[PDB]
Specification:
Chain lengths: ~80, ~80, ~80, ~80
């Protein structure tokens, strides 16, 4: 199914995922598309930072839901 | 100077700060105003998560700049 | 009538309500004022969590009553 | 170490615990001392609900800390 991930800088991308995918799995797909390693990503749904080991289902993220993405860098 | 801190869920608060305030200082101010514990706060500007030991001036955060606020639970 | 909804981190929200308002109506007022999604809200009176579908009058909540608010975020 | 568990009706109990105790272990001690079943207990520290599987040291809960206890039961 499709979900959207919107950066805080206004860029939207479309990902193909399954309810069973972990947040770690979703970050790997984002790297596949955008080149950002998972450790430098923080994903956000309903105002909360999500945990690598929980699933989209855990968070009730469904078809065409929008997550937000921010970078987590050191020094910048 | 005044800055705006916005959650992704529609709440805006205004804070009085100085350019030399650290992000740690700013989270303490948000705790004072809104009650949110500092370890559960993640502040965002320029599409990225901010670090506790840097100042507002370090990130070029100026008067009337908007920061975003998201929550992080986990061990916090 | 007015009621007060206190968090466990020392903040107080004042709400205008009616005795016939449901717990869900109260959560929608809190979403309007504070941005908190109703799905994350748990309202408390007399030390216990309150249920969707009941009215304020069903719990003997009256003018100037104080409720508590705690958050429960799906999946942490 | 000693900790306090306080309900929102002001009922306070003290418990003897170790930093390595899980939140579930704490709920079990509460059941032993006060006869509240663990399923009915929501334990809160720093405004956030605590996960059953995590330890007191995971949350940096130190000697003489106060946890709040909210009761969850349908029908009242």
């Amino acid at each position: 199914m499709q979900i959207f991930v919107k950066t805080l800088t206004g860029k939207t991308i479309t990902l193909e995922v399954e309810p069973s995918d972990t947040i770690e799995n979703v970050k790997a797909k984002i790297q596949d598309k955008e080149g950002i390693p998972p450790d430098q990503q923080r994903l956000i749904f309903a105002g909360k930072q999500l945990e690598d080991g929980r699933t989209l289902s855990d968070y009730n993220i469904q078809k065409e839901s929008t997550l937000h993405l921010v970078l987590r860098l050191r020094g910048g």
